[PDB]
C-alpha cells in the first residue's frame, strides 16, 4: 500500500477494421511482449548498479545462527533480532535457507524456543514464529 502510484511502418492490421469482411465470414482470425520487456527492465536494473565493494559471504545474522547451533546458546542471536528494524527482521526470516536438511529453520525454531523460556520479549518471539509460518 506504500508503493507510489505509477509505431511500425508496416502496420499489421487485418479483418473488419481494414474492410476485409470476407475473411471473417470464412473463419480466418502481446502480454508475452510485456513480460519480455519486464525481463529487460530486470537486467536493466542490474546494470544500473555495479557496486564492487568487498562484502562478506555470510551476513551478521546468519553467522550467529550457525554459531548458536554449535554452542546451543542463541542469546547473541536473540539479542540482535530484538535490535533489528522491522524491515530487517522480515528480510532475514524470509531468507532462511529452505533446502534439506533444513538446518537453519530448525536452528531458528530452537532459538525461538529458548526465547519463550526466558519469559522476556514474549510478544516479539511469538511474532517471529508467526512470520516463520507465513
Amino acid at each position: 500500500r506504500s508503493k507510489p502510484k505509477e509505431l511500425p511502418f508496416f502496420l499489421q492490421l487485418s479483418g473488419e477494421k481494414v474492410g476485409d469482411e470476407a475473411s471473417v465470414r470464412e473463419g480466418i482470425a502481446h502480454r508475452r511482449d510485456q513480460e519480455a520487456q519486464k525481463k529487460l527492465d530486470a537486467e536493466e536494473q542490474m546494470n544500473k548498479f555495479k557496486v564492487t565493494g568487498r562484502l562478506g559471504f555470510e551476513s551478521h545474522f546468519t553467522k550467529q545462527l550457525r554459531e548458536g547451533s554449535q554452542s546451543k546458546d542463541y542469546s547473541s542471536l536473540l539479542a540482535t533480532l530484538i535490535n533489528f528494524s522491522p524491515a530487517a527482521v522480515d528480510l532475514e526470516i524470509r531468507s532462511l535457507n529452505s533446502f534439506e536438511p533444513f538446518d537453519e529453520i530448525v536452528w531458528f525454531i530452537d532459538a525461538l524456543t529458548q526465547g519463550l523460556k526466558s519469559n522476556k520479549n514474549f510478544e516479539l518471539y511469538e511474532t517471529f514464529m508467526s512470520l516463520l509460518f507465513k
Binding site: 502510484k5 509505431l7 502496420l11
Partner: protein
C-alpha cells in the same frame, strides 16, 4: 453524432495508425469547472465569512494522505456478506 465535412488533417495511414493504439476533453472542462467553482466559492466565502478564510491551493507520485491505515488490507475492508 456529428459528421466532419472538412478535409481530414490525418492521412489515411494515420486514421489506421491511431486505431492500432469518458472523454479527455470532456474531463478537461470538468477540471476547468472545478477550478472556476472553487475560485468563485473562495471569493464569495471571504466576503460573507466572519473569520479568516485561506486561499485554496511523468514521475511516480506519493500519496501523503490515505483513507485507511497502511497496515490495513483491502480484503479486510469487506464484510462476509459482500464476499
Amino acid at each position: 453524432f456529428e459528421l466532419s465535412d472538412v478535409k481530414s488533417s490525418k492521412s489515411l495511414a494515420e486514421i489506421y495508425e491511431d486505431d492500432y493504439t469518458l472523454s479527455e476533453e470532456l474531463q478537461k472542462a470538468h477540471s476547468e469547472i472545478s477550478e472556476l467553482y472553487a475560485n468563485l466559492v473562495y471569493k464569495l466565502d471571504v466576503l460573507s465569512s466572519v473569520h479568516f478564510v485561506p486561499k485554496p491551493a511523468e514521475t511516480p507520485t506519493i500519496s501523503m494522505e490515505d483513507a485507511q491505515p497502511l497496515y490495513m488490507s483491502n480484503a479486510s475492508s469487506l464484510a462476509p456478506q459482500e464476499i
